[PDB]
Amino acid sequence: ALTFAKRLKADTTAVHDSVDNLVMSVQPFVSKENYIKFLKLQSVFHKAVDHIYKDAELNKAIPELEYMARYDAVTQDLKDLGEEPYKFDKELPYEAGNKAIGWLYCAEGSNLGAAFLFKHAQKLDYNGEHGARHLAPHPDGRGKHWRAFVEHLNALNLTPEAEAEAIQGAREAFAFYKVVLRETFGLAADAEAPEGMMP
């Protein structure tokens, strides 16, 4: 990998796939009840990167970053389902520095992949205007919007030392996501999708 954005993906594809498999494994779209659990998980994760999107310094290296946050859309999705705002039990990670960049990558990247989730959400009468607001595509199209975001990432001009932290940060973001998922769907700690399952 000769670029920052590509190295991130490279060092996190395995953990990313474990996330994809685990989410699918818990049947988020099998019922309104389960979907609600999926929204709560999403809520927590996006609440946890809300301070990163609105990060002064980061908004200098990346334009309109703050406006890319999906936390509100998720809370509104919860509203549409008859649920009041959800709040995590434990303490929410509040990452900063280069490791927080990894978290940003994780959250922003998840948009790129919400297409699949968006499609299955729409099978439950949940679309970008109701219930699946947080999954709808960026007005400019997931592809474009993302490739652009990528330029900004590769633009930070982080040193190998910096990337190392950001990448470790991206792994930790993916790890947290699974911790919340397990708790939200009532699984044991360290629970994973059936071994051998492919995304």
Question: With binding defined as CB under 6 A, does residue 131 bind ligand HEM?
Answer: no
Q: Which of 4, 11, 15, 19 forms a contact with ligand HEM (CB under 6 A)?
A: 19
Euclidean distance between CA atoms 55 and 40, whole angstroms: 24
DSSP secondary structure code for residue 127 in this structure? B
Q: Which stretch binds ligand HEM (CB under 6 A): 31-39, 106-114, 123-131, 153-161?
A: 106-114
Q: Which is nearer to ligand HEM, 16 or 82 (CB)?
A: 16
User: 131 - beta bridge partners?
Assistant: 127
Q: Which is nearer to ligand HEM, 113 or 128 (CB)?
A: 113
Q: Is residue 124 a contact partner of residue 29, using CB atoms and an 8 Å limit?
A: yes
Minimum CB separation from ligand HEM for residue 43, in Å?
Answer: 12
Question: With binding defined as CB under 6 A, does residue 23 bind ligand HEM?
Answer: yes
Q: Which of 61, 112, 164, 197 forms a contact with ligand HEM (CB under 6 A)?
A: 112
Q: Which stretch binds ligand HEM (CB under 6 A): 16-24, 60-68, 74-82, 152-160?
A: 16-24
At 151, which amino acid appears? E
Task: Annotate 170-186 with DSSP letters as a single string.
Answer: HHHHHHHHHHHHHHHTT
Minimum CB separation from ligand HEM for residue 170, in Å?
Answer: 7
Minimum CB separation from ligand HEM for residue 2, in Å?
Answer: 14
The number of beta carbons lying within 10 Å of the beta carbon of residue 41 is 24
Q: 158 by DSSP, 3-state: which?
A: coil
Question: With binding defined as CB under 6 A, does residue 39 bind ligand HEM?
Answer: no
Q: Which of 7, 29, 81, 113 forms a contact with ligand HEM (CB under 6 A)?
A: 113
Euclidean distance between CA atoms 130 and 127, whole angstroms: 5
Q: Which is nearer to ligand HEM, 82 or 90 (CB)?
A: 90
- 177 CB contacts (<8 Å, ≥6 apart)? 19, 41, 45, 106
- 43 CB contacts (<8 Å, ≥6 apart)? 71, 74, 75, 78, 85, 86
Q: Which is nearer to ligand HEM, 82 or 132 (CB)?
A: 132
Q: What angle separates helix 32-48 from helix 97-112, to the nearest 10 degrees?
A: 150
Residues in contact with ligand HEM by CB under 6 A are: 9, 16, 19-20, 23-24, 45, 105-106, 109-110, 112-113, 116-117, 177
